Design a protein around this ligand. Sequence first.
Ligand SMILES: *[C@@H]1O[C@H](CO)[C@@H](O[C@@H]2O[C@H](CO)[C@@H](O)[C@H](O)[C@H]2NC(C)=O)[C@H](O)[C@H]1NC(C)=O
Lengths: 49, 96, 49
Amino acid sequence: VKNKCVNFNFNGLTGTGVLTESNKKFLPFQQFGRDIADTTDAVRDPQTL
Amino acid sequence: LIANQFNSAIGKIQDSLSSTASALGKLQDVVNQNAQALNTLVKQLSSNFGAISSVLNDILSRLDPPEAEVQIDRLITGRLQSLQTYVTQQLIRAAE
Amino acid sequence: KNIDGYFKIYSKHTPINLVRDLPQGFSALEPLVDLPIGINITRFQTLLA
Ligand SMILES: *[C@@H]1O[C@H](CO)[C@@H](O[C@@H]2O[C@H](CO)[C@@H](O)[C@H](O)[C@H]2NC(C)=O)[C@H](O)[C@H]1NC(C)=O
């Protein structure tokens, strides 16, 4: 579910947030994004890339 | 004569402000010191404080309370001092 | 680089026209592959056609 406060567990990452489709373009190897303060902000969906 | 000196004087203020930012340094430091102090506060979250993981949800997820307590109690003591030191920084700066 | 019983490989294929030596510049290297042999590797050779 997108655009909704949903508790999410990605690859066993876990946490609660609002998941929205992102314009930032990951490099092929990268999997988990991070912020300036090193907080998980972007996650790459396993089943569908 | 006085008017012309006064009018030219104001004009000189524009150029010193327009070109050089070093004059306005004092205001910038309050922003820099403060904004920096937050970054130290936020970065502390990513510190283990002698525990298995810095991320709280990880410790909740992998291990159950009776032993999880010892892990979490270390995080709280670590973060709490970090919070306390940050506030005591602010109170000192606020008086200044 | 081989670490903690894992053998990692990185790569980059920048095109160059300076034939004498290594060009000045700064190209990042992506992780091409990871493969877990875990050996007491202490010597090295290359293979030329
Ligand atoms: C991997 O094999 C090498 C053998 O080439 C080991 O290096 C030897 O270690 C002993 C220590 O007990 C030294 O007395 C030898 O002089 C070493 N050989 C050389 C060529 O210096 C090495 O210790 C092995 N790796 C591990 C983790 O034990």
